[PDB]
């Protein structure tokens, strides 16, 4: 459909230079994030449909949950080990479904039950690389002015309006969502 500012998206008031072409913001604590990415799979539909070589990012936010910032480091570990797809469902589950993730040791146990070697996790968790990823996330949440999640910003300049995409079903919504992004990408 026609894309116009204020309808399917809004302009960032202070854009971010040298940002990835797509930046996703989420929290493992957020029921809406679970709903958006694990059930409806809107970010995954989007990731599948963008042009080849599109620079993508997915950042965790500190500001939800008692272990927000510990969970942001967990997500950095997941990125560093490249096991996002394996642990992401378990981390959502452990936070929201079973509430079995009570402490940082529980985060560690979660990675290990998702097949990550304890020794790799221990090497990674306070590594320079994981430290850099944590900084990367935290700074992104500031520079993109992210106050709520799920959120997606394109070209460091356009903020998606999730309540501005219309669909007769969630399945269409994700396709519809993916449709809007690619239009903002060619822009």
């Amino acid at each position: 459909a026609d894309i116009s500012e204020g309808k399917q998206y809004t302009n960032l008031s202070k854009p971010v230079a040298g940002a990835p072409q797509v930046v996703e913001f989420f929290s493992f604590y957020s029921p809406h994030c679970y709903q958006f990415s694990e059930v409806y799979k809107v970010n995954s539909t989007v990731e599948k449909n963008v042009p080849e070589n599109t620079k993508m990012a997915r950042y965790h936010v500190d500001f939800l949950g008692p272990l927000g910032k510990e969970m942001t480091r967990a997500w950095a570990v997941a990125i560093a080990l490249g096991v996002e797809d394996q642990v992401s469902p378990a981390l959502f589950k452990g936070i929201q479904e079973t509430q079995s993730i009570r402490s940082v040791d529980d985060i560690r146990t979660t990675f290990i039950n998702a097949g990550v070697k304890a020794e790799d996790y221990d090497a990674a968790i306070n590594s320079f690389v994981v430290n850099s990823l944590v900084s990367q996330q935290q700074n992104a949440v500031t520079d993109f002015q992210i106050n709520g999640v799920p959120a997606m910003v394109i070209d460091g300049k356009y903020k998606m309006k999730n309540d501005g995409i219309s669909a007769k079903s969630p399945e269409e919504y994700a396709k519809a969502y993916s449709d809007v992004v690619n239009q903002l990408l060619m822009k």
């Binding site: 604590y29 029921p31 709903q35 709520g148 999640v149 999730n162 309540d163």
Partner: peptide
């Protein structure tokens, strides 16, 4: 439910 987000 895309209407609202968690802040």
């Amino acid at each position: 439910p895309w209407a609202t987000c968690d802040s």
